[PDB]
Amino acid sequence: VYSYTEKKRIRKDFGKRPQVLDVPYLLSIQLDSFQKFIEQDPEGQYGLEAAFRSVFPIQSYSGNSELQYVSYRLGEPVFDVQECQIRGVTYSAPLRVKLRLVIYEREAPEGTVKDIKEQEVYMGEIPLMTDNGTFVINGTERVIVSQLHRSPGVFFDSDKGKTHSSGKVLYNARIIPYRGSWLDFEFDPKDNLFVRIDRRRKLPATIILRALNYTTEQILDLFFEKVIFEIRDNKLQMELVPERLRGETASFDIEANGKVYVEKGRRITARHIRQLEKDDVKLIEVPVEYIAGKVVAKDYIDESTGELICAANMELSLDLLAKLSQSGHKRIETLFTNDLDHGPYISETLRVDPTNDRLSALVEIYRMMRPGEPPTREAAESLFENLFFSEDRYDLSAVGRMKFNRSLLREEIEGSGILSKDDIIDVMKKLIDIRNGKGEVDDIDHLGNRRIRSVGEMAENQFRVGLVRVERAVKERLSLGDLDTLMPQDMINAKPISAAVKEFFGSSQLSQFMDQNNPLSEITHKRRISALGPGGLTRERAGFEVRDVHPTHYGRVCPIETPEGPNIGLINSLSVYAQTNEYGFLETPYRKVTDGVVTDEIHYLSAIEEGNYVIAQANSNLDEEGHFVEDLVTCRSKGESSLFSRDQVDYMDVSTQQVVSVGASLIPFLEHDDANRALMGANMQRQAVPTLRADKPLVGTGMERAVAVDSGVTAVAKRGGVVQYVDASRIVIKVNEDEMYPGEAGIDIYNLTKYTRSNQNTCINQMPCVSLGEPVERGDVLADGPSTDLGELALGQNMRVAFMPWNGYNFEDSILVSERVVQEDRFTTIHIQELACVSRDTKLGPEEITADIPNVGEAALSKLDESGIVYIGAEVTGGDILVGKVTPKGETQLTPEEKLLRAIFGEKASDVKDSSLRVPNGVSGTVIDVQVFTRDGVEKDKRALEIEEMQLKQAKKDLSEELQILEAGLFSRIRAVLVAGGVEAEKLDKLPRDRWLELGLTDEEKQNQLEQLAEQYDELKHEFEKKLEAKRRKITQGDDLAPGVLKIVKVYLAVKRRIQPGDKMAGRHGNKGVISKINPIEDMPYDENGTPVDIVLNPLGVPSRMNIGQILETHLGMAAKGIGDKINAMLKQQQEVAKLREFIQRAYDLGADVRQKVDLSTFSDEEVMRLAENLRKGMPIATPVFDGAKEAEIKELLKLGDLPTSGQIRLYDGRTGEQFERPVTVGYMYMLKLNHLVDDKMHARSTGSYSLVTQQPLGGKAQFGGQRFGEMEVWALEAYGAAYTLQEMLTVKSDDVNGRTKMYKNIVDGNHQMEPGMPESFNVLLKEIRSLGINIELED
Amino acid sequence: RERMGHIELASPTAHIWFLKSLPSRIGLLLDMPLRDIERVLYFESYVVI
Amino acid sequence: PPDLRPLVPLDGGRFATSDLNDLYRRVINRNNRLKRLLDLAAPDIIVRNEKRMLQEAVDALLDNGRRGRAITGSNKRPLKSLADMIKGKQGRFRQNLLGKRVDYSGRSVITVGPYLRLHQCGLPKKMALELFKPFIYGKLELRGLATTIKAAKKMVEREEAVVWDILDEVIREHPVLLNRAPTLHRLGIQAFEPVLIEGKAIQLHPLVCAAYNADFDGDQMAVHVPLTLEAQLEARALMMSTNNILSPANGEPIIVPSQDVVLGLYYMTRDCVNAKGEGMVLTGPKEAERLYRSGLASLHARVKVRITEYEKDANGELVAKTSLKDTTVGRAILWMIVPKGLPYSIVNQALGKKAISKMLNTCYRILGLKPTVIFADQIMYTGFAYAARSGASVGIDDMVIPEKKHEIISEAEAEVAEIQEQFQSGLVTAGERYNKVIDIWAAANDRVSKAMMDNLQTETVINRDGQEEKQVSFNSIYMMADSGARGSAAQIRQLAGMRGLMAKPDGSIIETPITANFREGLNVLQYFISTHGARKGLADTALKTANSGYLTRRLVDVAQDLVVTEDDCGTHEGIMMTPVIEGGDV
DNA sequence: CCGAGCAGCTACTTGTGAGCGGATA
DNA sequence: TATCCGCTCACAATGCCACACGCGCTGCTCGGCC
Ligand SMILES: [Mg+2]
């Protein structure tokens, strides 16, 4: 079974890996993200409930007045997406929130609140994305890319090498919340520990530790262990465990139980440890000079004198030892210090701790946070408790707590948003351990540590940023509001939140309009992951670590799709089968592998769980029953390829395309190309321009059937039905009986979009590709959009290409083209440019768009209409006034009598200024559409009336089609009900029943049914009239433009630009070039059969830049064309359908054990002829990214046709007419015309305008400006001689306000001699320095 | 292009370039640490004369 | 000054103002407020705070952001002060004093011009018209064609048939300056005589763009007009392409031929063992060219011809000697191009890149500069022509896979397997295992590369009245590689043979090599490791060109403070130059 | 009261060099 | 008290080109010898 569009023209496929997971929705990421944004979710989960329940409710300053939040709702969009595009307003929706003001009387803290005010209030509008994941803010379609940043949680960086130049590696722990204040623990070059709060002063960690009501003994018991020294008869015996002395030398005779164990000066070895553990002894004998090196743990108080003998973190001395012995403390707890197990880091941080108690710690940390402002202890504590433990300024999200609990090896993964003392204790212990040697650092180059945020999360963040401002506003407004004086509507304003969301969608480092030039760019732009913007690094401050791609990027992000230039690696494209995890990570599907069989199920593994299991090779030769043909298999354990067994593996790749992007999967024979060429090709395919007539690519990849369908460029069938009405503008389909709704249903209508300007000055047009009466299925394509062909992506065009030098015209990378290409309307494209004319309201009278243009003849005004706008279809090549804008300059109050008089008699209209808008000098073409928007109040000109009347006629045509269908059904029903009165029906109801429903007899049932049907009829008519009136009021409603404008006029100039020497064209393997010189058809080389070649590339570009696959593709292309040729030879000569069917079967049954297995005997024996007709142009061939056709398959496919097997054919010269030796290869290659047309690059200026800040010539191509003589150009010129040349290039041609005029006057008078003068910008610098307190002066 | 005017400041002020040169001119000329000169400049302390 | 302050009437009641205007206005506001407070006898603390605020305002006007608090005026962006209008890459020095935009300039995408001579270049018609409008006006006023400037301007706008000849006359000997966007050395800007061409692209000579480092994949270059007699004479005298044949860095010529011409000449001179007309005799190179173009003989075949060479004696004499040589028809045909001074031993070679470069070097050394330009031009012409007539083409069957590559790969696999067995036996540790795997894979890669080379050289046997006469391989990819045209040894090794070893992020070498090539299919993980290793080298240049530009700017700033101002200093001290022999031999 | 212009609603760069305490003999 | 060491702050980080876009709303304060 195959789809209906596949029955039109099924594409031959190769490959031997039967895929198990189909291609998912290419735009599922942003669609699912925005679906998670706007929806009623309980438990305050992602979207909008979290932002509300986190901020709301709000309470006054103990005023018993609370504002509760119940729910929210999104109203219907006030304008459709098409209406928003044609008008320019945003495709947004209202946000009505039902709030609850519960204010209660005084003298009752928890008194039962009464006089509840439950009210729905509107607060700003939010932009809704279309079915394609695009936002329409101001006419254009803006897409929000997903941002890759650091996952909230904890990280452990290892600063080595140059860091501190001391040869000591430091380890710094960073706690980064999702929203709040950071935390950073680190070590000095010494063994000191310090902490900082958001890049503040480096201060010790014991102070912030004791800030949370922590004493010294508690900290010491938490961090370090306890060594017990007992006061025995003498020698102060000590407990011993043979594992704590591992690695130390014996400074004394370690002997116990009357038996020597370790001698003085013997390092305790592992055998010594085993010997000391065999007897299991604890108490030994230790000298007096050994205790002096240790240090007491806790503060031991005296009971005789009531004083302190010794404090913590103070090394013991002999006098202190005698004191503590005479005090009576038998058990003395000391620290266990060992550089290999427990490095002393808290002891030093303790002895550098200036403050001891909790209160001075708080005031010191307050002084460290805020300069000065010395509070008391209770006033300072507010800051320390509000910065790290308040849920309003610390917002560790669910993924943050998850990563935090996973990093510290904790079972539970849930928690709160605020921190806790035990968490800080644990992270400090982890830092100490990772310094001691136990534990490894967490690299930043790991997808498990890099979190991806979608448009929904950024929108929620900005919503919260606005909500905190509105919260402060409503809190300061609630300071005076009392009971029974205000509804919960006036205290809330739309301003902050609405503006916040609007600016987040309008102007940001992520808010950009989509590059609407081809569906491939549309898909690769929405699946684009950036590292810039807020919360991400900058390209100017990025190291060689974020640019490099990790082995953890396998299947989660493409490694070959990257914009080469200023940001390499920072901007990537998501993988094909990559999905967004619930927590916000990159998940990749994998097939679960059991002992012997690989079950056809999928598990979406995360980034952290990759190293735990092992993944099997994607293209590993596998046997039946989910087995491997070989015992050993190529796998990867932890980002390292290796060789494993057939049973140790646990997971397999789902397919072979998940490693590349969707923009890279369309590169045929990608496995035969280098990484650099593949990157340059996949990037250039993004810049394809839609040709005038699309055409199927021969050497395809199979994925093309998805991009052109999964996107929103083509007309997809929402309900499969029968074609009713085919037209270039609209397509009307009749829904099948089953798919049709059982009530108030009808037929579907798709309004195709005609030639309209895109976001890159390209034409976007949809062409119907269905026939009348042809049944279509649901999801099938109906109309091919730009660069599409029967539901298949088709960017460029296939051409006959040879590879041989031709008189150096393909010198380095230049492309040679025959006149046959440009003559056949092949690469000619359409460019649509928008020109705006605004009638701004100024003083002295507003502007007019009339047609009375004085100081000019009729030739320049012959293209203007009665209203003052150029006609629809009026060509223009030079500067010509296409809209009659005039503005009054002096006295207003020009009487209408004298106004019409000036148009007939009298003098000219004075107060005009001739400020009309004309087309710039250099652009040509024919205007195809004019747009006008009039503010409510200004007189609508008759052209706007005509435009709205035309669109109303269109909408009325649709509504009348619907109404006539419903009325035909209803009249069939009335015929079915009055059949009882048959003779009068057939007599006086054949012609006149359509207007004479009035009948009557036999009341009981006939009157009942007739009345029911008449009621249905009048209700239907009234409903359709209501729909028509609503549409009229909608399309006639004037849109707002700006404060101080009357009307805005827009025109669209469409120019057809053909290929010419100077254009940039490229294949699909990074072989770019420029058309060197168009050639006559006779001069181009031709084969011994007479078919001339179209494109003659340079074969020398293949070896160095290793893109060989194209050649293969070329070969395959030839084979494809060959088959088509045969079909043409079978179509021109009238052949029976049996021979054609057998030939197509033999072609599709190529001997490669492919997974296609299509049969021709199942077709209708009629669509076979249509399919063959759709194959005479060639045989479309699909090719997986890595399972492509081998050499032998292409060889046998070529030998199927009459083409030579070697792929190289003898070629004759077009000029000399002789045979080229060394038979050149030739085939059919798919090429692309890049969006770098020469007509927008060539530019020149003799003498134009000059800047006002300094008298220097402008540049650019839009304005008539020259080029910039760069500083390196000045260096190269002064490296030469040319002193006069530099002096003229600097001031005489650019800056001399009085020299360039003199030089021009001399040149036009035949005088080639210059005058130095003085550069004006130098005087500008003199004035600027003089504007300062610095005096600059020229001497004699 | 060349005619200039002026502003008669009621209070004579310091030139930030000569005060934030690192080393600043006044910081070396007046043999006074830049911290104290900045303290005097922003009116949070006094200097005797 | 007021007009020096940017303030232009924007669309509507709003005006596009400067950042200095807000500064000056705030300064004036606070000054007026302070003057008011001083008259009302305000409290000491109030006037103190007012003086502090006025000080803040004036120091922000002087240099905003230096005090510590970068105030914003609009858009929440740092405001522009007077110091900001001088410093950085946006002050007057970097933007409006050193490099300024010039008039009479243009810009366009480049394209290959293979017919124009070395000293000239192409130029679009509309471009040339727009550049030389004043010269056209002057020449129109000269003849009895245009009385005033308005008539000439209208005729130029209309572009009558009487103005094209004027444009051809004004660009008869008026050179222009071609300039690449990134300028590195003196050759970043050159002078060329323009010839008018109907089109929108700039036709460029193929032998000069190599100096420009300008490929034809869409590079746009700029054009400038000298506009002065001194200027035109300087551009014709110094900045001309003919006057710059040796790079200022090294004495090696910068006019070295590119890949196309050298491939054509290599194919022309690469002789086979048997072809059409092997063993015959030819009188002169003209008869050889006649016999070749007639098709009665091949292009490369050992033939005994007679050459008439010329040798330069001690004085300016050119002695002539006629002798019979045994050379290929290609060399004999190419001999009609070289001037008389050069001997025949320079053509009787395979004529690779190094060979043709040293040939041009010897030509410039013996014959000077005047004939060297036309010699190189004729070299390029003949190379293009014969490379076109040759039919060089790369194909799938052209790249051959070594038949014994499979057994070598299997032997290396057995070796790494027994090494892993030894490691599992506990005898060898992990580091020595890694080293013994890396070196074994390197030896296997060297063996398979030597095999691929000696295989690409063989299977070229042709019967010349005998049984087998194995010769130099005529494979197209080998012709493009061995001749040094475009392909190197390592490139073709990665192409046909195994790619070898790759790298990991830190810089080490992975223990699993890429046992596949490009012609054969590449595994998914192999291609992943390949692109991982290649992205590093790709981003390398993209990040490093910035440091290169900064270094160039620093170096030129340290430079340009000295010129040759004396003819002799009159000292005797110097440096003792010695050939360094550290490390290797020398 | 009127009009005109202007204000509130931060942290993966790293390295280099210079300056300012600061603590150790 | 001199003097090396550690912490803090100023300054730098190609070049070109091409396209597109932007600085709002309510609120506050100053404007004026005919
Ligand atoms: Mg280039």
Swiss-Prot record, chain A:
Pfam families: RNA_pol_Rpb2_1, RNA_pol_Rpb2_2, RNA_pol_Rpb2_3, RNA_pol_Rpb2_45, RNA_pol_Rpb2_6, RNA_pol_Rpb2_7. It comes from Escherichia coli O157:H7. PROSITE patterns: RNA_POL_BETA. The keyword Nucleotidyltransferase applies. DNA-dependent RNA polymerase catalyzes the transcription of DNA into RNA using the four ribonucleoside triphosphates as substrates. Keywords: Acetylation, DNA-directed RNA polymerase, Nucleotidyltransferase, Transcription, Transferase. Its EC number is 2.7.7.6. SUPFAM superfamilies: beta and beta-prime subunits of DNA dependent RNA-polymerase. This is DNA-directed RNA polymerase subunit beta. Gene3D superfamilies: 2.40.50.100, 2.40.50.150, 3.90.1100.10, 6.10.140.1670, DNA-directed RNA polymerase, beta subunit, external 1 domain, DNA-directed RNA polymerase, subunit 2, domain 6, RNA polymerase alpha subunit dimerisation domain, RNA polymerase Rpb2, domain 2. GO terms for molecular function: DNA binding; DNA-directed RNA polymerase activity; ribonucleoside binding. It is an enzyme of class 2 (transferase).
